[PDB]
Amino acid sequence: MIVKNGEKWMDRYEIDSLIGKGSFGQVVKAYDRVEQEWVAIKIIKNKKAFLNQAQIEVRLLELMNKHDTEMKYYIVHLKRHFMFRNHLCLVFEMLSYNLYDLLRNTNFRGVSLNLTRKFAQQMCTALLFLATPELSIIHCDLKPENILLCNPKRSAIKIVDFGSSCQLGQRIYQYIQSRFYRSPEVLLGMPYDLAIDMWSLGCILVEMHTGEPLFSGANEVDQMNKIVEVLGIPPAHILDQAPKARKFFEKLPDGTWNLKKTKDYKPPGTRKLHNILGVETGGPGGRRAGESGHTVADYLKFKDLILRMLDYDPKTRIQPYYALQHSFFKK
Template identity: 70%
Template sequence: MLTKFPKLFSSRYQECSKDYSFSLPHFDTNAPPASLMVVPSIPEGEDSRNRQKGGPHNGGYDDKNNDYILKDGECFNARYIILTEKPIGKGSFGQVTRAYDTVAKEDVAIKIIKNKKTFFDQAQIEIKLLEMMRAHDTERKYNVVLLKGHFVHRNHLCLVFELLSYNLYDLLRNTNFRGVSLNLTRKFAQQLTKTLLFLSSPELSIIHCDLKPENVLLCNPKRSKINIIDFGSSCQIGHRIYQYIQSRFYRSPEVLLGIAYDTKIDMWSLGCILVEMHTGEPLFAGSSELDQMMKIVEVLGMPPKELLDIGPKTHKYFGKTEDGVYYCKTTRDNFNKCYRGPGHRKLHDILGVTSGGPNGRRAGESGHSVEEYSKFKDLVKRMLTYDPKARISPYYAVRHPFLRPRTTSHSGQPAASDSPTTKMSYQLKHFYTFIDFFKIGRCSPVVIRPSSVVFPTDFRWRDQNKETSSSELWLRVQSRVHWLKCLSQVRVVAFAEINSVFFSFRRTSSEPLELLKDVSR
């Protein structure tokens, strides 16, 4: 196809351009969804070339499923030449095709939404979210696919994206479903946790809602750089649209139970993805929602009672004794004789922590030590915590020991940046010891009163043996608040300024407030 492209492009573009009486329209990539640009691809009276005469669907342009019938070489929006009649991707939303952008002179991917109002409306939400992410990631650091623009073609909303390579499921298939190395799994995890940190930021608060290997694409087939695609099911916290979300294998317990969800459901999906990328097989491959829950229980044991008590759909999966003890319905009702009971499958064994990796395939390989596997298992367990409130947040996930880059000095010893005595490690050690923080701002200057935080009179600098007054503390921090969370009998504050960071916290016990001074310098 590509060898014939220059001649094909020349002839097709001449056909498109010579019949137009208007100039090439401006492609407004910043236009909001409400002001979508509608431009005919073929002038009136000249459309018999592609039209199925007498066709019942959209004047013959659509098939019975409301998908646009692609024609090789057709011109979209007086700019894009369709390169193939066979889509490169297809889903409930519509299809994705490859095209050539005659203005930017590059190949692109065009997502053509089905000609149905529900899909059209949802795609407008996707555009809004993608434009928000683009505005907050001008340097392209957070691994989100780039939306180049959008337009309407014959009643089909079209989204133009950068063209990427194959997805992580294709990568697994290329390994014959034996999985990729722990090092490559780590590289994917580093990027994906960074993306989730970006999506969960207060400025965005976006839930992807369909994170799975098929929606994570390599930017280059020979590199590990990835981008997340398909925000067609996504929403913002407070604007949740659907109850039925997430592909089943990657569906979180709170969604299965019908409990209100937030960005933590994407962290659950990521935990499932990371295990699958290394083992080559889905961790929880349920054939139905009931089977999915039982597969989860087999590995993680029973969900906490507090979670089951508030789940509107708990009765689908669990029964309850007169004493208020929950049990799996499959256990009592003998629904599935293959079910082996809560906690029967161990994550330790699935990953092969002490046996050389999954099925012993990585035994003796560099980078697959028991220590590395133990770190990997710990991260996955934190991602697959039943209670979303206790599940690891993106902020802590990106700082997990498994994901921290390993560097060595010329002497072969760990570099200073890896030493547990360094200031950053010292800071993280103490954060892990006490409480998980809820980030509500990005060092925005605020006016705050010292009286809003209660300081004991006997607190000391951790590295100084002298008392410090509250007023002196507030002068030092210059009223720049980084995190703030108030819990029952616990008040946690972290202050940030350009060159230094001060952290303070008070424990529920009688111990005095401790302050880590200048840990970032």
């Protein structure tokens, strides 16, 4: 499309500037003369594939909007949508910069355990809202870039980008989530549920504090190998029901599984989250040695919560309500 600054749409919106680009199209800053406020307009490409998937995004945002709870306010607000020049246009409140930009601004050294906690509490409350039975929405693409500050002065956040999202039992794609944040059940080709967003969140929170992705795989095989370095071989009962188990693993006579190895990873379960976090060693790279709010006891609570979020079994992985009751969140 490539929209000029100064362009006026429908005697209502004046286009200012490009905010961002994506596979879906583009996000522009625009002035709404009716509400008298700035808005972010997500402009979908005029191609059937992108239109049809953005129509699901619009449906799921409208579904969330009509459930006024108190847990609804960690999702970006869709104000309205329209068709213009054969592009579906989604009008959102303006938010600020994203949590990947936040990490880039720390030179990838991470934010404090106290700021990590504030993000974790908001995100767990968002996931509790999506798990409302009448919604049952799987975000499917949680990552730092898809979490935006509400205000550059403040630590409030909202989730954006429901472009991959589906309701439970309305799955389209087997291959979903951004690779670094992709759950073992998705890597293993298994039917997925809301628990894949909790996996992503556990990956996200470690990264927000260390500055670096927990599992930075170059491809699905490297991904699973990096998860196994930290968490060990997945349980047999999961691998036994997994269509893609033999992408990564090999079963042996006695009903046990091991990695397929290629040409020359740390042995399974030996890259300890205890050491990645630096629980007993002054935090990541020892850079938090001495800082208040970064005691061993504070770290052990964080580590415990993360290891519950990174349960291989989506049935036993911690769920949002129970994550909100964790000791990590008690003052």
